[PDB]
Symmetry: C3
Subunit: 168 residues, 3 copies
């Protein structure tokens, strides 16, 4: 796809989501911006542990590429949690992560090139006891909801194969 | 927003949007909704709190004759309440027996219900298996309850990040 | 024109997802004589039960039983992977376990490719919760996910079970 098109690819551990997202990115074009939040030589890498929208817009690199792949919403959410004063307090973390995600959504709406985003599903096991991990799971689920609802396409990976959750 | 299902099951993980989607379905029932809360929102809705014995409490309230539909929040807490009301939560069989009785009574009440129901439950079985028998038992019993309800339900939706996958539709 | 069934089916799901009941229905669809391969570390009466905790392809082929039945149901990839993990010297070391599990899975795929009768395989989804801290559990989850990817890529049909009901992930 071309334009301000957005695809969300989510799945569990070893679900093949990164491979599938890279296929989608290759479908965008040959010059891909790889945004890492923690490989083809025509791809550019921009490393942004936080404030992804600001850093990508300031880089001006959206005007240089055919598309963007974001790896990954999971680490963006954990980075946001551990940047807070008290990782055991849910509300400030949630506010910060929503801010991050809304800035990303806005940048994508205005983006000249399409984006594919990789994220993790972590909410379908047994709930953990310590507040930090619970908060991280909760906030990641919220981020994934926001992205899926704004995305044009959403794919849920099961054992390397994509289930279409939302399509054009 | 689906319409005209008598019994709908909406299940999903943590922060999957299952409550929002179930409330949309409920609003599709009508303006007067009975909200059955199992813990232990529109102003025209009635709230009935029943941590256990949901079929018994709802039938005894007579409120099914007062509303356009019912939303049950949630099977997850119903199962945990059932587990912890037992003498020995590390003992599987009494818990499973009690939970199955609860679910079968709920199914019968829904079969006889004059108004439709949407039920919210959680998927908890697709992570790493837990070590303590109590958590294993809870996960197991909730999965069994979800199977019984999904088989009875007319429609079943599996939520992924706020969006519904149709698992079963009449 | 006589239709043909699915030669290789993968049924995966979580705890109490109804994956075993659905797979057994598929197996019964194969025919009346079904080989039930149980992998647990050591049902219709027309079925034969073969206990094989490890080296499934070798034991099943050497048994010559593929020529005796209408189909095979493998219960289950989950226990095959855990057996493989705990048969290693150091379960905290990922690479030897991964090699052994991949060898097991590739041998299974090869035998299924040669099989005169269809197969349905039961496995678990374990990768959609919170990542655990201890290396051993992460290793197990990772390796099982790899095994499921390998089988799903080879399978003709793949079903993901939710609360007893099948979602079709791959067909035809």
């Amino acid at each position: 796809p071309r334009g301000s098109h957005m695809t969300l690819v989510l799945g569990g551990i070893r679900s093949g989501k990164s491979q599938y997202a890279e296929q989608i990115a290759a479908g965008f074009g040959k010059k891909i911006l790889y945004v890492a939040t923690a490989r083809p030589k025509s791809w550019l890498t921009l490393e942004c542990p936080r404030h992804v929208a600001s850093a990508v817009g300031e880089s001006g690199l959206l005007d240089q590429v055919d598309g963007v792949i974001l790896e990954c919403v999971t680490l963006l959410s954990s980075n946001t949690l551990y940047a807070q004063k008290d990782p055991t307090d849910y509300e400030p973390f949630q506010e910060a992560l929503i801010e991050e995600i809304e800035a990303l959504k806005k940048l994508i709406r205005q983006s000249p090139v399409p984006w594919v985003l990789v994220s993790s599903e972590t909410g379908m096991g047994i709930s953990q006891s310590d507040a930090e991990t619970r908060h991280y799971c909760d906030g990641l689920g919220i981020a994934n909801q926001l992205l899926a609802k704004s995305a044009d396409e959403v794919y849920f990976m099961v054992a390397g194969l994509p289930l279409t959750v939302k399509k054009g």
